[PDB]
Amino acid sequence: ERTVKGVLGTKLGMTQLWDEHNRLVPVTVIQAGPCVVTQVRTPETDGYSAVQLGYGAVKAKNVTKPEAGHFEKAGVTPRRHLVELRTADASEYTLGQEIAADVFSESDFVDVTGTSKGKGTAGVMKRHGFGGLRATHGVHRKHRSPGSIGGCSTPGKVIKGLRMAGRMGVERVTVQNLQVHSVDAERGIMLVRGAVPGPKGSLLVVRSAAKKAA
Amino acid sequence: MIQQETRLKVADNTGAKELLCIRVLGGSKRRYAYLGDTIVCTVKDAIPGGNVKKGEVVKAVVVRTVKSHRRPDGSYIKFDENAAVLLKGDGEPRGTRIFGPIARELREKKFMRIVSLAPEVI
Amino acid sequence: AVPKRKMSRSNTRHRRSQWKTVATKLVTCANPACGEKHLPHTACPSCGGYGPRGDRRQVVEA
Amino acid sequence: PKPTKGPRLGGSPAHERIILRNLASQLFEHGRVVTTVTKAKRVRPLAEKLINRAKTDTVANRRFVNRTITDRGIVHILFTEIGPRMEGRDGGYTRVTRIGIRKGDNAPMAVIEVISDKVA
Amino acid sequence: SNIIDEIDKASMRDDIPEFRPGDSVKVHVKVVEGSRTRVQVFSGIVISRTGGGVQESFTVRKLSFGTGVERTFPLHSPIIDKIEVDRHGAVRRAKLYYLRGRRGKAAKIKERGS
RNA sequence: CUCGAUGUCGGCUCGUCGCAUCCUGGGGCUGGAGUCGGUCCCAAGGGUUGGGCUGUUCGCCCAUUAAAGCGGCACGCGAGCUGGGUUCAGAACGUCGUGAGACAGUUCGGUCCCUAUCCGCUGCGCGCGGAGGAAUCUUGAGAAGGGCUGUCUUUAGUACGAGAGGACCGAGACGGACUGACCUCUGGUGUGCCAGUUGUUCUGCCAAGAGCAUGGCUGGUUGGCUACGUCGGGUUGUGAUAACCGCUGAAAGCAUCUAAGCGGGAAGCACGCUUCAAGAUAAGGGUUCCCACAGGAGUGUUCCUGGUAAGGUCCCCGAGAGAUGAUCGGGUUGAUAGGCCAGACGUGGACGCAUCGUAAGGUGUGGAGCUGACUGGUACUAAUAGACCGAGGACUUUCA
RNA sequence: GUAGCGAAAUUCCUUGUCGGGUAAGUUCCGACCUGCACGAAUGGAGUAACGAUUUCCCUACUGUCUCCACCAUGAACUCGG
RNA sequence: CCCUAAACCGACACUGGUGGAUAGGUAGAGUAUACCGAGGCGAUCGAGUGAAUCGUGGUGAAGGAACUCGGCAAAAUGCCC
RNA sequence: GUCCGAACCCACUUCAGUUGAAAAUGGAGGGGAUGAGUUGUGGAUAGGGGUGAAAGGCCAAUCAAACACCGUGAUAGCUGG
Numbered sequence A: 001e002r003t004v005k006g007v008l009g010t011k012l013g014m015t016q017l018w019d020e021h022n023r024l025v026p027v028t029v030i031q032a033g034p035c036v037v038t039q040v041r042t043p044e045t046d047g048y049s050a051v052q053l054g055y056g057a058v059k060a061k062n063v064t065k066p067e068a069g070h071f072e073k074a075g076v077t078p079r080r081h082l083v084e085l086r087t088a089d090a091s092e093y094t095l096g097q098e099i100a101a102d103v104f105s106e107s108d109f110v111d112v113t114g115t116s117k118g119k120g121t122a123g124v125m126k127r128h129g130f131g132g133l134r135a136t137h138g139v140h141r142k143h144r145s146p147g148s149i150g151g152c153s154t155p156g157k158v159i160k161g162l163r164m165a166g167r168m169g170v171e172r173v174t175v176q177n178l179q180v181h182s183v184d185a186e187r188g189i190m191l192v193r194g195a196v197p198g199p200k201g202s203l204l205v206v207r208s209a210a211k212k213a214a
Numbered sequence B: 001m002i003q004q005e006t007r008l009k010v011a012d013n014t015g016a017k018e019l020l021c022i023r024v025l026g027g028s029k030r031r032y033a034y035l036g037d038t039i040v041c042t043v044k045d046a047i048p049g050g051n052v053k054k055g056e057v058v059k060a061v062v063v064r065t066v067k068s069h070r071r072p073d074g075s076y077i078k079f080d081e082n083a084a085v086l087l088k089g090d091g092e093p094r095g096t097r098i099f100g101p102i103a104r105e106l107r108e109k110k111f112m113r114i115v116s117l118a119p120e121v122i
Numbered sequence C: 001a002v003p004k005r006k007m008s009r010s011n012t013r014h015r016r017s018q019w020k021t022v023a024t025k026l027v028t029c030a031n032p033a034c035g036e037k038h039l040p041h042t043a044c045p046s047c048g049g050y051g052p053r054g055d056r057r058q059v060v061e062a
Numbered sequence D: 001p002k003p004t005k006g007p008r009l010g011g012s013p014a015h016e017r018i019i020l021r022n023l024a025s026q027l028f029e030h031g032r033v034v035t036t037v038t039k040a041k042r043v044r045p046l047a048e049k050l051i052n053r054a055k056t057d058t059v060a061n062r063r064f065v066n067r068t069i070t071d072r073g074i075v076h077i078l079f080t081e082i083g084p085r086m087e088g089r090d091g092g093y094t095r096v097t098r099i100g101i102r103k104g105d106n107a108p109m110a111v112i113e114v115i116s117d118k119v120a
Numbered sequence E: 001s002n003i004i005d006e007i008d009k010a011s012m013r014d015d016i017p018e019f020r021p022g023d024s025v026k027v028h029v030k031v032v033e034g035s036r037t038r039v040q041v042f043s044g045i046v047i048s049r050t051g052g053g054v055q056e057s058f059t060v061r062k063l064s065f066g067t068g069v070e071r072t073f074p075l076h077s078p079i080i081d082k083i084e085v086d087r088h089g090a091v092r093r094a095k096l097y098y099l100r101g102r103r104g105k106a107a108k109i110k111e112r113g114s
Numbered sequence F: 001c002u003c004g005a006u007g008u009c010g011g012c013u014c015g016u017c018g019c020a021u022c023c024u025g026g027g028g029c030u031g032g033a034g035u036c037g038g039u040c041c042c043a044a045g046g047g048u049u050g051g052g053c054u055g056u057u058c059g060c061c062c063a064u065u066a067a068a069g070c071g072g073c074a075c076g077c078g079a080g081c082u083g084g085g086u087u088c089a090g091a092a093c094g095u096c097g098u099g100a101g102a103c104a105g106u107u108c109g110g111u112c113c114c115u116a117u118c119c120g121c122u123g124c125g126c127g128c129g130g131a132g133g134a135a136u137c138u139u140g141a142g143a144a145g146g147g148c149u150g151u152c153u154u155u156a157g158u159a160c161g162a163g164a165g166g167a168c169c170g171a172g173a174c175g176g177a178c179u180g181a182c183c184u185c186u187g188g189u190g191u192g193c194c195a196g197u198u199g200u201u202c203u204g205c206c207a208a209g210a211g212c213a214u215g216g217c218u219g220g221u222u223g224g225c226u227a228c229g230u231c232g233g234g235u236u237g238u239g240a241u242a243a244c245c246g247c248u249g250a251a252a253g254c255a256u257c258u259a260a261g262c263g264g265g266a267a268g269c270a271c272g273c274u275u276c277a278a279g280a281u282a283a284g285g286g287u288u289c290c291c292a293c294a295g296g297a298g299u300g301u302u303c304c305u306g307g308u309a310a311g312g313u314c315c316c317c318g319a320g321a322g323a324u325g326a327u328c329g330g331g332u333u334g335a336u337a338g339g340c341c342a343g344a345c346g347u348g349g350a351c352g353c354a355u356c357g358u359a360a361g362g363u364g365u366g367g368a369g370c371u372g373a374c375u376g377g378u379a380c381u382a383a384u385a386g387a388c389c390g391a392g393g394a395c396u397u398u399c400a
Numbered sequence G: 001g002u003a004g005c006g007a008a009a010u011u012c013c014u015u016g017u018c019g020g021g022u023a024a025g026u027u028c029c030g031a032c033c034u035g036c037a038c039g040a041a042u043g044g045a046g047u048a049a050c051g052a053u054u055u056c057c058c059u060a061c062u063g064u065c066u067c068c069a070c071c072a073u074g075a076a077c078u079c080g081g
Numbered sequence H: 001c002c003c004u005a006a007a008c009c010g011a012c013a014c015u016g017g018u019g020g021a022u023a024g025g026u027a028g029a030g031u032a033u034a035c036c037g038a039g040g041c042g043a044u045c046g047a048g049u050g051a052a053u054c055g056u057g058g059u060g061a062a063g064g065a066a067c068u069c070g071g072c073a074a075a076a077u078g079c080c081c
Numbered sequence I: 001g002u003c004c005g006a007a008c009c010c011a012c013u014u015c016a017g018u019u020g021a022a023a024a025u026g027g028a029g030g031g032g033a034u035g036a037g038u039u040g041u042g043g044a045u046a047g048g049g050g051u052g053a054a055a056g057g058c059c060a061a062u063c064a065a066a067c068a069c070c071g072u073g074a075u076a077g078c079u080g081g
C-alpha cells in the first residue's frame, strides 16, 4: 500500500567523514550499482504490486537456461541477484528499466536490509545476553549455564519460546532511518551514515525510510 | 567513567580532599558518570581547616576523568586523575577556586562559573 | 540421567538404521595403460600417476 | 605466514611451529615427503616463503633462512639446487597430491614435493 | 577496496608536516565558544600515531598544573588549524606510553641528532 | 496421597501468569483557587535502581528514581548453582537430670553424586510428498518480536489567585534504561608480526642465530572477535472499544446516553513497524526452461526395468558460512585459495660496511630490515579427471 | 554468691540502652546493669608471646563484581579403530 | 631378571604407596627452580576441526569488594645487602 | 619441643574427580621440618579383650564390642513369596 523507492547494492566497507558541523560521521560505502527491472508484478496477473530488480555481475557459463529465458523475456543481460521491492507504484516501472543510485538524493532517510554476520552455535550468554553465574563462591561447573528453564510439577514442562543456545546470525535484518550522506551515480557509490548488517561483499537492499524520518 | 564506590580527588578549595561516589544522578540504573555529570558523594578525607567535614554527603560535578571522552568532531580527551568539584545545590561551586585543567564539556551551557574559575579549559 | 524404560524394537531400529556409511565412489584412471579405479583427486594406487591422459605426472613410486 | 585459525598441530602451537619447521626442512632434504593432507597444506606457505627468500643468494639471506631450518646442509641445498631451479618461477614452488588414507587411523595422506622441472 | 581509498582522498589533507611520536608539537585546535570561535594551542609530546589513510590519528600529552592531559586528534580533522613541530625527539618506541608514569627529568626526551 | 526416599530456608540464573495497579495512559466525584492532592472507576503494553545491617524471609536505614506494586507457579526454579541457616557424628557455655544424657537455648566446625532413554524446549539436518521433471522470484493462512521514560526550553508568569504561587491542552531540544545491527572511531584481546631482555643449552668459533623456561618475561600491535565503543529503533498513526462524556428519544403526554440509531472516548484489543512462514498434505501464485525416450511384461494403458533432456549432486579450491550435516562462492571458457609482485597497516632503524669509543656502546649508510589476516594485480601451484541422480506428455472426472 | 566479671561461646525478652565506627552497622569495640539462667582449681579475672582457630576494621591489591570480552589447550564435536 | 616399577603392595600393563646407596655442569644460599651432563625416554589408540559448554592456564579499559554468608579464589607482596 | 625453607611427615583452604587415574586421590597454595621428629627390620599386647596426647578413635578397605566356624534351617504377633 506504501510507495517505496529502492535499489540494490553491495557492502564495500566503512570509513568516516566530517559533516558541515565538523562532526565525525561513520559512513558505510554501498556500491549501489545499476539495477534492471527484470519483472513487474501487477494485481491482474500476480495479485500485488512489486518490482523485481536484478543487479549483479554474472558469468555467462553460470546462468542456466531457465534464468537465461527469464532475462531474455526481460530484454536485459543476466544479473546475479534478483530481489523484489514491494512498491505501490510498480506500474510506473517498465520492463528492463534502468535504476541507479541517483534514485536517492543527498539527505533522504533510508532503510537498509541485509543478512547479518553469522556466529555459529552461540551460547545463551552471547546470543541472549544471559547473566551467568559467578566465577567463584562455589559455583560448580555452571559458570555460563542458563540457570533454570522452568518451574516444577506445574507446568511440568518447558514453555515454548524459552531462550536457549542455538545458531545466531545469518538472518534478515533491516536497519532504519539511516540518512544517506552522498550519492555519486557516475560510479554507483552511496555513502550512508551508519552501520548496516552483513559482512563486506554482501547484498544490500536500500529502500526509502518506512517511517519517513525520526 | 565514575561509578558507585569510585574515589575522586577534589578540584575545589573547600578543604575536601577525597570523595566517594554514592550515586550517579541522571536516571535510574545509570552506571557511570562522565565529564560534566553530577554525582552524590561522601567526603572521605578533608583538610582539618575547612568548611567541609569528613562523612558529609555533598553533590559534585565530575571533571577530569581518567578513562577518555569522545567529542563530536572525533577527537578524544583524557586526564590522569578522576577529579570533581562540589556544588551548592544550584549548579554553583561551593569553593571559590578551581585547580588543574578542566574539560570543555563543562562549558556546555551549564557550568559557566566553574569554566570561568578554571585555570585551564582543555 | 538413566534410561527409564527399555526402548522398543521399533524405536531402537529407527535410531540404529541411521548408523551407516556411503559407498566410496571411485574413478577410472585416465592412464590408458592402467584403466584402474582410484579415488577422485588422488593418485592412482596402481600406476602411481596423476593428471589427464595427456599431462600425466608420477606421484607414487608404486 | 597466515596463522592456522583452528587448533594447532601436535597439541600445542609451539609444537606446531617445530613440526612445520622440521617438515619444511625434510621437504627440502628429500625433494618430496608424504605427510598427510593438513600438514602438507600447512607447510606449503612456509616452504614457498623460504624458497623465494633463497631464490636470491646473499649472506644476509642465508642467515635469515638459517633462522628457520637451522641445518646448514639443508640451507646449502636450498640455496644451491632449489633456489636456482626457480629462477623464472613466480611462486608455486611446491605441489601437493593426495595419495589415499592410512589404514591405522584413516588419516588422509598426501605428498608435497618441490617442483623439479625448470620453468624455462 | 581502493574505492574506499579514493573516497577517503576527498577528506584527507595535504598540509600535514612530517613528525614522529617523541616530537614536541603544537596543535592549533579550533574551539567553538557560542557565537565566537578561537584557536587554542595544545602543546605537548606526541606519544602515539595510529595510522591508516583518513583514519590516521595522533596523541599529544601535556603536563598542565601538575596533571597530565592527553588529547587524541584525527590527523585530517577539520578542527585542527595547523600543526607545528618544535623538537624532533630521539626515541626507540612507536608508542610512548611509558611517559604516563614519568615526571621530571625522567620524563624528558632527547633531541634528534644528539 | 508418598516412609522398597515426593531433598525442606534465603540468594543466584531463567522466566511465565493473575490483577487485588507502584509508575506511565484514560475518566467520574471531590471536602477539585492555581499548584497539588484523595477517593474509586477503566487499564496488565512496557517499566518497576544501587547499597549498609542480618544466614535470613521480614524489617530498618543510606542515595536515588516516573516508580522502587502485591501475589501464583511443590512458600516457581539444588539430575541449574549456592550450603550461610536448618537437621548427623566433635566441642564449649547456660539451664535441666544422681547419672548416661536433654534443650523451637546459644556458640565454633562439619562430604552436595548422576555420560539424558521418553516427553518438553533451543537449534540444525536427512527423507518423502506437494499428479511431469526443473530453475528462480514470491503471496501470507498463521506465528514471533517490539510497545519504558525523564529533565530542560517554549506557549507563559498566560489561565487561576488577595497575594505568594502557578497551569491544562500543544511545540522543540537533550537524556536514562532497554535493544538490533555493526567495527569507521575509542577500549580490550592477541600462542602472528616486529622489538628489547634474564638464565641456560646449542648451531666448531667470531659474527649471525636457534631450542626451553607461562608466548620465559617485558614494550607495542594490523586482521578477526568484541563492549567500555558508534549508528539505528520504540513512534508519528488507523479501526473497534473499557470506564466515562454525549446526541436524538420513547415505553411513562414530561424526563432519560437507550429501549431504534448515531457520535466521541486509553500506553489496553486488532493493525501500523520488524522477523519467520505453503508439512497452509488446503502443500499456494507469477515468470522461465526441458520435452511425447527405449525395452519387457501387460489386460484401458496398467506397472517394473534402462539410457537421457532441463537441472542437480558427488569430488576438488575456499569463506562472507559452519559442531557435523547445511549455506554461499569458485572449479582452467578460471582470480577460489596459496604463492608471487606492489601497497597499506604493524614494529622502529636488520645484516653488512664505514667511522667514533679502552669497552659496554654511539653515529652514518637508511623510515632501514622484517612482516599475517587488509587492498590491487599476476595462472606460478592446487582447483586433475570423472561418475551418479534426474521427466515423458506427465492418474482419473467434469467443465469450458 | 564474696573478690572479680556481666546483653558474655552464658541475656529469653533483644536489633536492650547509650557511645564509637559507616553516606547507611541485627555483626564489631568500649560502657550500663534490669545476671530469664556469671562467679572463684568442673577454677574467677587478666595476660607479653603463639594460632592453616572464631570475629570486626583500615590499607594495599586485584575479573569478586559493574560486565564481561578475547587467546591457547584436555574433553566435547566429525572420521577410522 | 624387575626393583623412587608395566614384573613388588593396590582385582589392571592403575596419575597411589614402597626402605637404602650413587647423584656431574651453569645460574643459585641450596639436594629449591631453570636449562643441561652420565645415562635414559617420546608415555601403550589416532587424524582432524577457530560450535555451545566443562575443565586448565593467559591478558584487560575505567572503577576497586560495589561480589559474597564470608575478600572464597585470584591479585599484590616476595630475594640479598 | 627457636626462625625461614626442600627432602621427609602432615592434611588447613580451594578447584577437579566423584560408573574417578585412585573403594579417599590429583592440581594450586598450606602446617611441622634437631624434635613430644620421622622412618626400616624383628618383636609384644586379642574381642567384654587390647590399645587410645581420649575422637567411642583404632585393632587387615564399614568396630557402642573384630573376623571365621559352630549351636543353626536362631528367632521375628512383622514384610515378601
Ligand SMILES: CON(C)Cc1ccc(O)c2c1C[C@H]1C[C@H]3[C@H](N(C)C)C(O)=C(C(N)=O)C(=O)[C@@]3(O)C(O)=C1C2=O
Pocket (backbone or CB within 6 Å): F087, F088, F089, F111
Ligand atoms: C545436617 O543435616 N543434614 C541434612 C544431614 C547431613 C548433612 C551433611 C552430611 O555430610 C551428612 C548428613 C547426614 C548424615 C547421616 C549419617 C547416618 N549415620 C550417622 C547413622 C547414616 O545413616 C548414613 C548412612 N551411611 O546411611 C550416613 O551417610 C551418615 O553417617 C552421614 O555421613 C551423614 C552425612 O554425611
Ligand SMILES: [Mg+2]
Pocket (backbone or CB within 6 Å): A132, A133, A134, A135
Ligand atoms: Mg559474570
Ligand SMILES: [Mg+2]
Pocket (backbone or CB within 6 Å): A139, A141
Ligand atoms: Mg570452575
Ligand SMILES: [Mg+2]
Pocket (backbone or CB within 6 Å): A156
Ligand atoms: Mg506432564
Ligand SMILES: [Mg+2]
Pocket (backbone or CB within 6 Å): C011
Ligand atoms: Mg522417536
Ligand SMILES: [Mg+2]
Pocket (backbone or CB within 6 Å): D003, D005
Ligand atoms: Mg586467529
Ligand SMILES: [Mg+2]
Pocket (backbone or CB within 6 Å): none
Ligand atoms: Mg587431537
Ligand SMILES: [Mg+2]
Pocket (backbone or CB within 6 Å): D014
Ligand atoms: Mg614454548
Ligand SMILES: [Mg+2]
Pocket (backbone or CB within 6 Å): E049, E051
Ligand atoms: Mg605507522
Ligand SMILES: [Mg+2]
Pocket (backbone or CB within 6 Å): none
Ligand atoms: Mg520407588
Ligand SMILES: [Mg+2]
Pocket (backbone or CB within 6 Å): none
Ligand atoms: Mg481491574
Ligand SMILES: [Mg+2]
Pocket (backbone or CB within 6 Å): none
Ligand atoms: Mg508486569
Ligand SMILES: [Mg+2]
Pocket (backbone or CB within 6 Å): none
Ligand atoms: Mg493481554
Ligand SMILES: [Mg+2]
Pocket (backbone or CB within 6 Å): F058, F059
Ligand atoms: Mg527482620
Ligand SMILES: [Mg+2]
Pocket (backbone or CB within 6 Å): none
Ligand atoms: Mg512474581
Ligand SMILES: [Mg+2]
Pocket (backbone or CB within 6 Å): F075
Ligand atoms: Mg520452594
